[PDB]
RNA sequence: UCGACA
DNA sequence: ATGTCG
């Protein structure tokens, strides 16, 4: 299988995790940074790979995009698959932040139809994904 | 008991 | 190290 370069590639980055939690979407064939999260205070690794691919499903239908979502985590890409975040961030006053941008994601995914095949970025084989953050 | 993706 | 799934 080859690199789908006309799509939209997502990834998240934190400080810690859990820890600040940000993320971004980018054009998988120049780089250019199409959508970037502000940094969240407080959530997971996952919860952000989630946001991220959800964002990237709402920015693509809205500019009636047919192109597909590139994500490297296979936890995100399940969570969107079945419209459900199962997160074990402890729900607190500390997460909240994170947890109502969770929530709001999923009530997103729950009330819009779309047909973007969201795929794992094999990244053994063609290296980072190309909205990364963190170290190689 | 891990293996895997982050 | 911690977050999650097969
Ligand atoms: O802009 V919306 O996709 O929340 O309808
Ligand atoms: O712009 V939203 O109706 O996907
Ligand atoms: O972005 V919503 O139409
Ligand atoms: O209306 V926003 O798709
Ligand atoms: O723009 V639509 O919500
Ligand atoms: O505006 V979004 O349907
Ligand atoms: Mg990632
Ligand atoms: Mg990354």
């Known amino acids: ?29 120049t780089g250019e940074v ?10 997971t690794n996952n ?22 979502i590139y994500s490297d985590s296979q936890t995100a890409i399940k969570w969107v698959k079945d419209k459900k975040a199962k997160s074990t961030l402890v729900r607190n006053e500390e997460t909240a932040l994170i947890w109502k941008l969770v929530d709001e994601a999923e009530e997103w995914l729950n009330t819009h139809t779309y047909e973007t095949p969201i795929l794992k970025w094999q990244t053994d084989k063609w290296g980072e994904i190309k909205a990364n953050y963190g170290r190689k």
Not at 12 to 20: D, E
Not at 34 to 43: A, C, Q, S, V, W
Not at 49 to 57: D, R, W
């Open 34 to 43: 199409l959508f970037e999260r502000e940094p969240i205070p407080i959530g």
């Open 47 to 68: 919860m952000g790979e989630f946001l991220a691919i959800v964002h990237g499903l709402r920015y693509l239908k809205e500019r009636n995009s047919r192109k597909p």
């Open 1 to 29: 299988e080859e690199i789908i370069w006309e799509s939209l590639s997502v990834d998240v980055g934190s400080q810690g995790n859990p820890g600040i939690v940000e993320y971004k979407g980018v054009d998988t064939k």
